Amino acid sequence: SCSVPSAQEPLVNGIQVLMENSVTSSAYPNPSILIAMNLAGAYNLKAQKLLTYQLMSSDNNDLTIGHLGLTIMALTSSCRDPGDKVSILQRQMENWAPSSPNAEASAFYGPSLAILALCQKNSEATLPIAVRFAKTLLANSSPFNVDTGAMATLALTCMYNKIPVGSEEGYRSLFGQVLKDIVEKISMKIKDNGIIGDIYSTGLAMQALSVTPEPSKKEWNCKKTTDMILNEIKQGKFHNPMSIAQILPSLKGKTYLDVPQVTCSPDTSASNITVIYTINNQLRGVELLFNETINVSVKSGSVLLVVLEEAQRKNPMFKFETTMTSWGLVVSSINNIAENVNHKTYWQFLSGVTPLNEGVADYIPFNHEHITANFTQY
Ligand code: B12
Ligand SMILES: *[C@@H]1O[C@H](CO)[C@@H](O[C@@H]2O[C@H](CO)[C@@H](O)[C@H](O)[C@H]2NC(C)=O)[C@H](O)[C@H]1NC(C)=O
């Protein structure tokens, strides 16, 4: 009802190639990219094989609940036995629970990914965990996250459709109800322009909407959203391979639920712009900061990361560390104080007062932008 117009296909093909082309021996092995190219039908068979091998050999002790889920699905989409990882994931999940009943919505993202994976390998063995998961989700009150909601509906839809014959005890009722719940919250996060939540959460939301068993009261204009996406691509919004990985499936009319059905082997300085960069902190382990600066970055371009690099050059001791992930460079430490996920604490970036929608290697700061780095919690 809202496929990509065969006229815009070249556009989709292009980003697919951009995304596959990012796979290299040093590149961070991204399971979402593998899933995406496999659901789309891979172009570059060497990149396909390389990534598949990097994941087959990933160490189970290096992966988080969500990594694990993603990696199990990626291998499966490459028609490779995940073996070991599913057992490991199953037991970690029987041991999972949120930090509290007021835990942030995104706390559920990884677990959603895991349940989806486990659901694909053995639905019945996953009921216990999924029932518990649905109840925990039903009980949470935090402000809604579309990305998480999307993942959660996929996982629950997977279960919803695999209710064991004979085992007829409101499991369907529970999952259906929580799904209805989430769809209502996903809808109503739907802008008039077609965006759902935000651009980088729209791809996942499209998968969820095309797959929940029960739509929301307010109808969703699918075409309006896919058209908005195509235009966004044409404006250079999807240059991040991970961002391509999250919309490609939708653009090809597939979702993570199609993974099990994948067919394999198919037939130093200054310049022109000056930015104002503040770094902050307020705390427990004391050590409070609050120091500004003005940086001279090139043209516009020199991503917001050049700003941080030059600021470290002036050496006001406020240097930093960066850590690699599926989305790119994450600023993990500033002036000798790291993120530490145990304390649900990290560095949040913002323009003025509003948080950035892109990372430091992607964002392009304007004229005299005041970009702050508050060390908050989530
Ligand atoms: C949870 C979450 C966070 C938490 C992470 C907790 C944790 N360490 O587990 C925290 C609060 C730290 C965070 C921060 C930010 N995030 Co965030 N985050 C998410 C979310 C909801 C789920 C990710 C996840 O757990 N995936 C499952 C696991 C298993 O996969 P993973 O690959 O291992 O996940 C890792 C990465 O996703 C990484 N990560 C999280 N956010 C970001 C952002 C950037 C720019 C990068 C490079 C990496 C990164 O954290 C995980 C640790 O490895 C996503 C949604 C999505 N679509 O991906 C948004 C999302 C990835 N985040 C986003 C953004 C923009 C940010 C920030 C730049 C916001 C800001 N500060 O202004 C900050 C940047 C931090 C910094 N200082 O560099 C955007 C990215 C858009 C883009 N880059 O084009 C997304 C897509 C949300 C959206 N729809 O807008 N995030
Ligand atoms: C920067 O970070 C601080 C602390 O993380 C934020 O201040 C908190 O504001 C919240 C409001 O949601 C209060 O409940 C907390 O008590 C405050 N924290 C502290 C340390 O007292 C501050 O608002 C953030 N600045 C932004 C987003 O511009």
Give the tally of structural domains: 2
Quote the CATH topology of the largest domain.
Glycosyltransferase
How would you characterize the largest beta sheet? 6 strands, mixed
Order of helices and strands: HHHHHHHHHHHHEEEHEEEEE
Q: Any idea what the shape is? A: globular
Q: What level of helicity do the residues show?
A: 40-55%
Strand content: 5-15%
The structure class reads alpha+beta
Compute the number of helices. 13
Rg is 22 Å
Counted beta strands? 8
CATH architecture of the largest domain: Alpha/alpha barrel
CATH class identity of the largest domain: Mainly Alpha
Distance between the termini: 38 Å
Bound molecules: cobalamin, a molecule of 2 linked components (NAG-NAG)
In short:
By secondary structure, this protein is of the alpha+beta class.
How is this structure best described in words?
The chain is built from 13 helices and eight strands. The chain is of the alpha+beta class. The protein folds into two domains: 264 residues, Glycosyltransferase; 108 residues, Beta Complex (Ferric Hydroxamate Uptake Protein, Chain A, domain 1). A hairpin with a 2-residue loop joins strand 4 and strand 5. The chain starts with 8 loop residues before the first helix and ends with a strand. Bound molecules: cobalamin and a molecule of 2 linked components (NAG-NAG). Cobalamin binds next to helix 4, helix 6, helix 8, helix 10 and helix 12. Promotes absorption of the essential vitamin cobalamin (Cbl) in the ileum. After interaction with CUBN, the CBLIF-cobalamin complex is internalized via receptor-mediated endocytosis. It comes from Homo sapiens.
